[PDB]
Amino acid sequence: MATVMAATAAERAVLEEEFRWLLHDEVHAVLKQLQDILKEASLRFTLKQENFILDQVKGVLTLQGDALSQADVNLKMPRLLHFAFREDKQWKLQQIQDARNHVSQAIYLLTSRDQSYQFKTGAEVLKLMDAVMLQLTRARNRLTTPATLTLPEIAASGLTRMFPALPSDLLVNVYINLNKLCLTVYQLHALQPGAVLHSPGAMFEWGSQRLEVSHVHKVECVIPWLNDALVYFTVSLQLCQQLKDKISVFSSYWS
Amino acid sequence: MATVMAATAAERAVLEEEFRWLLHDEVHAVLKQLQDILKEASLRFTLKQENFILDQVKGVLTLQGDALSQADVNLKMPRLLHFAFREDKQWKLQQIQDARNHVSQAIYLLTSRDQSYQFKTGAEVLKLMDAVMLQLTRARNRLTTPATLTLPEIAASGLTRMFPALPSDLLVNVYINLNKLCLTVYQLHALQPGAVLHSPGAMFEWGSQRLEVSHVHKVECVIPWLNDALVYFTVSLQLCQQLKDKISVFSSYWS
Amino acid sequence: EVSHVHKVECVIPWLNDALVYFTVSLQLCQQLKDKISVFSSYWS
Amino acid sequence: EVSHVHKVECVIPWLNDALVYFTVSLQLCQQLKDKISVFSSYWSYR
């Protein structure tokens, strides 16, 4: 009988539609929450603590946003030496700038969409989620220790120029590792008549001379607002994943 | 006007071409660097330290390349027993052999290509990168503790045969865990009238008898050249990923 | 506003056993997938 | 100046055989390479 089948088909069509509205509201709820969390994460990168104390080598670094405004270092040798920047100079930590960029892009992805359209399949939501998650994971990854930084790249870095001015038996590197501001001093040794190891006994060329890393000193300190930011990234990623999974369940449920 | 459009189109075509050459040089630079790093990683697996001292159970193991040439073990019981190999015998650690194979394959992938061809889309570079990265990640994974090794497989291993010759209340396993040579002694207990747990209170059958693990003793020691190799793997993976990402950015930029 | 946070924890043995089981099962699955791929690429 | 061009040709059976042998050999080599790569990507050759 055709009347049965038609009224009936109307009943399933009604249920599916109502569920589509439920999923619509869920999607926009999660999106709004993402904008809130991510804007707070953004606010963490611009101005909260600025002075940090970092074993057997010690340091007091003043870090304002992405700019290492000052770096005062004491190295205890077999003998102590003391170093500082040009007083006037600032060294920018590229990791923070990069991360802040990814955050900015994610937030743009969330705020540049009309929060007023009727619900669809979800593949579009899925693409939005993928984009945002890519930005977050990239931010986090950049915050992490870059492995591909060579000793000659460290030497060619402006940071070496930034200090009283110091010899070529010492290299200084300052970077970020997830939730920790990191200061590393490489003690070198010219060799008698690659570069990736970063461990004692690593060899590389610099200038026109051949050098070997003799010792490595590593100190670090937690940066509270970086930690907050990372926590935000993790939470946002999970929110995105949950939305993706629910959308998949829905779409497979009614197909 | 058609003259405008043609000269113009020539201008964009010129810019895109020049950028294609930039990307060409970048690709080959990164590839060369990969061969250097990976060949050093390769050199680490063949001959550097050979004798290693490994809690409440102690061991002196002589490891040459992939071959555990000797293993001298002291076990302190409630009472001490002392064990060694047949003096003449060597136990090979399969993880190192496997890892070395993956490294060999990666290096082949890099050296068996003409470093002189004109630049293309990149999908081919992308496939090369995927292949290499798969080999690296597999090497690293193999170096890691294999979870799927059962106690009966440990018993059926030649290592048990390799020791003075010892009872069936003791099983000895030597394996690699990332950057650590590992020695584990399983103290057993025949049961009165699966096998995966590796924890105290795990049960399994061996020979024609049913046995239970009574206690587990685990000691380990860092292998410096393994650590160097792993560091190399990580750095290479990141270099590959960076190249993939840049190629994607380029390809999406001009499409 | 949260003023202080106190966190304590304790290992649950059977949860640990379960997790170990999950890891081992995942590896078994992965190994089977990889072998199947090797086979299929080998004869194609 | 070239006024006209005349081109005649003939199949050389043994040359043809040679080309066939080259191609077939190339194919054998690639198949072996593929098997070796497939196996070696997961297991050790020895």
Side-chain angles (χ1 to χ4, degrees), chain A residues 138 145-148 150 194 196-197 199, chain B residues 37 44 228 232 234-235 238-239 242 245:
Chain A
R138 274 179 179 171
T145 301
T148 67
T150 64
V196 161
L197 293 174
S199 64
Chain B
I37 298 181
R44 300 307 165 94
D228 289 345
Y232 282 145
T234 291
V235 171
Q238 288 186 17
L239 287 178
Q242 291 175 355
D245 290 337

Side-chain angles (χ1 to χ4, degrees), chain B residues 70-89:
Chain B
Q70 180 64 59
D72 280 4
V73 191
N74 298 349
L75 175 58
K76 161 99 187 59
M77 315 199 200
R79 283 228 192 170
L80 175 148
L81 308 192
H82 176 67
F83 329 115
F85 277 20
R86 202 39 66 157
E87 265 191 23
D88 289 345
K89 293 179 179 179

Side-chain angles (χ1 to χ4, degrees), chain B:
Chain B
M1 173 60 171
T3 297
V4 181
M5 308 190 315
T8 60
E11 294 292 340
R12 192 86 207 171
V14 164
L15 275 66
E16 182 179 352
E17 218 32 60
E18 301 180 326
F19 263 96
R20 294 183 84 84
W21 284 107
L22 289 178
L23 186 51
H24 176 259
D25 285 286
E26 172 83 21
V27 162
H28 287 291
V30 170
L31 286 181
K32 172 185 181 316
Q33 192 178 351
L34 280 171
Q35 311 193 18
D36 295 342
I37 298 181
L38 285 186
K39 285 181 173 170
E40 282 296 327
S42 179
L43 279 179
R44 300 307 165 94
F45 284 80
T46 68
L47 47 85
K48 151 174 46 182
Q49 187 171 345
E50 314 182 352
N51 298 321
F52 300 95
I53 56 106
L54 288 68
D55 297 29
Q56 302 333 308
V57 176
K58 293 179 179 179
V60 177
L61 283 69
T62 304
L63 172 65
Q64 286 167 12
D66 53 14
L68 186 59
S69 65
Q70 180 64 59
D72 280 4
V73 191
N74 298 349
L75 175 58
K76 161 99 187 59
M77 315 199 200
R79 283 228 192 170
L80 175 148
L81 308 192
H82 176 67
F83 329 115
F85 277 20
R86 202 39 66 157
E87 265 191 23
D88 289 345
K89 293 179 179 179
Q90 61 188 354
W91 177 246
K92 270 185 190 189
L93 300 181
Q94 87 179 356
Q95 296 172 264
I96 299 182
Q97 203 193 356
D98 294 343
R100 181 181 55 248
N101 170 67
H102 293 305
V103 176
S104 172
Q105 282 303 310
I107 294 179
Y108 175 80
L109 286 169
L110 292 174
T111 64
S112 69
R113 188 153 178 284
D114 53 348
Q115 306 152 6
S116 72
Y117 176 77
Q118 318 185 42
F119 177 80
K120 19 50 195 182
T121 73
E124 192 180 354
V125 204
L126 291 177
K127 284 179 186 175
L128 175 59
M129 291 291 95
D130 288 337
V132 173
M133 293 178 77
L134 181 63
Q135 287 311 301
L136 297 175
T137 53
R138 274 179 179 171
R140 173 177 72 192
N141 282 349
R142 308 272 179 144
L143 278 190
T144 296
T145 301
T148 67
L149 172 72
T150 64
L151 296 160
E153 275 164 345
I154 294 175
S157 169
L159 191 64
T160 308
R161 316 179 200 148
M162 283 274 301
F163 291 101
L166 291 194
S168 38
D169 173 344
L170 285 184
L171 277 178
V172 172
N173 186 27
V174 175
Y175 59 88
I176 302 178
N177 191 343
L178 297 173
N179 82 333
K180 293 172 184 58
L181 177 56
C182 298
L183 165 64
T184 297
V185 176
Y186 297 100
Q187 222 171 3
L188 308 171
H189 181 60
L191 299 177
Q192 304 180 31
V196 161
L197 293 174
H198 287 268
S199 64
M203 330 180 209
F204 70 104
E205 179 283 332
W206 175 232
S208 317
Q209 323 82 7
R210 302 183 171 278
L211 292 62
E212 152 182 327
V213 174
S214 65
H215 315 278
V216 179
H217 309 279
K218 285 165 339 193
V219 290
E220 60 187 359
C221 170
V222 168
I223 309 293
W225 60 269
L226 270 186
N227 193 85
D228 289 345
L230 291 177
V231 165
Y232 282 145
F233 294 169
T234 291
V235 171
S236 297
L237 280 173
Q238 288 186 17
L239 287 178
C240 291
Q241 187 64 247
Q242 291 175 355
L243 185 52
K244 285 190 61 176
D245 290 337
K246 294 184 187 159
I247 285 172
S248 171
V249 164
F250 179 97
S251 165
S252 293
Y253 190 83
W254 297 97
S255 308

Side-chain angles (χ1 to χ4, degrees), chain C residues 2-43:
Chain C
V2 174
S3 65
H4 315 278
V5 179
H6 309 279
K7 285 165 339 193
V8 290
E9 60 187 359
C10 170
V11 168
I12 309 293
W14 60 269
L15 270 186
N16 193 85
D17 289 345
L19 291 177
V20 165
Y21 282 145
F22 294 169
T23 291
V24 171
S25 297
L26 280 173
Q27 288 186 17
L28 287 178
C29 291
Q30 187 64 247
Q31 291 175 355
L32 185 52
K33 285 190 61 176
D34 290 336
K35 294 184 187 159
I36 285 172
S37 171
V38 164
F39 179 97
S40 165
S41 293
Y42 190 83
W43 297 97

Side-chain angles (χ1 to χ4, degrees), chain A residues 27-96:
Chain A
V27 162
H28 287 291
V30 170
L31 286 181
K32 172 185 181 316
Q33 192 178 351
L34 280 171
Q35 311 193 18
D36 295 342
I37 298 181
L38 285 186
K39 285 181 173 170
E40 282 296 327
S42 179
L43 279 179
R44 300 307 165 94
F45 284 80
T46 68
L47 47 85
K48 151 174 46 182
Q49 187 171 345
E50 314 182 352
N51 298 321
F52 301 95
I53 56 106
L54 288 68
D55 297 29
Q56 302 333 308
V57 176
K58 293 179 179 179
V60 177
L61 283 69
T62 304
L63 172 65
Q64 286 167 12
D66 53 14
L68 186 59
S69 65
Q70 180 64 59
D72 280 4
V73 191
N74 298 349
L75 175 58
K76 161 99 187 59
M77 315 199 200
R79 283 228 192 170
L80 175 148
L81 308 192
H82 176 67
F83 329 115
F85 277 19
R86 202 39 66 157
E87 265 191 23
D88 289 345
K89 293 179 179 179
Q90 61 188 354
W91 177 246
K92 270 185 190 189
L93 300 181
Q94 87 179 356
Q95 296 172 264
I96 299 182

